[model samples]
Target: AIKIEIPPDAPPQAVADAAVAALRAADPGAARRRVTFDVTGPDAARVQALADAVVAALEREGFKLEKKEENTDAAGNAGAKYEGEGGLVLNVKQGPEALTLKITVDGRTIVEIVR
Candidate 1:
């Protein structure tokens, strides 16, 4: 559980690097690698946009999913949670405050993004 603060307008790929850095610092040895983003902003729409772009970058980076539990609230906050094979779990939301990402590296992992 670490924090990597960046510009509110930073690209998702950039943010992903921070997240991966945290992954190494925390689970520097075991547990594999999983990622989550607690996205937030000064407003609703802005945060949702961030969430959408981030999620897109995630998928484009080779994180494939059978289906995603993607949705939005009445306030239009984006929700991106991937249904996985116990490997990497990505659950990010927009709004409120700091979000927590709990990444667990599982042996059953289907994808390997770590290089």
Candidate 2:
């Protein structure tokens, strides 16, 4: 996975806006592109729980559920994708540190947090 760090001293809104700008510069229609989150982890059970909570929270906040799925990679990493509206997509990947949440809008990655 490609990691893009957002400095803690910088504003999230500004960072997100910059991502959108860079993406739009490459493709003018990117603003309306569908946002998708692909989450993966070493443990299936833990990854599933994390994804479920995120989906439930977003639903409570008014984001329509568009799709949900579960899968395993060749290396046996558990993964899922939860897509919706409101221009927000969250991807949680299970790592040695546990979970990391990556937030993206309009198909452009903005910020990420290790939790």
> Tens digits of per-residue lDDT for model 2 on 1-115?
2344445444433443433344445556543555544344456665555566556644654556654565556765655555566454545454444444444545556444333
The Cα error of candidate 1 at residue 42, in Å, is 6.0
Worst 10 residues of 1 by lDDT: 106-115
Off by over 4 Å in 2: 1-34, 85-98
Query: Please, what are the lDDT tens digits per residue for candidate 1 over residues 2-105?
Result: 54546656655556555556656766653335434445544555555545554565566555544367778788776666554435455556656643233445
Q: Provide the lDDT at 75 for model 2.
A: 61
TM-score of each: 0.51, 0.51
Model 2: per-residue Cα lDDT at residue 91: 53
Give model 1's TM-score versus the native structure. Answer: 0.51
lDDT of 2: 0.49
Clash count of each predicted structure: 0, 0
The local distance difference test score of each candidate is 0.50, 0.49
* Top-lDDT structure, candidate number: 1
lDDT of 1 at 36: 41
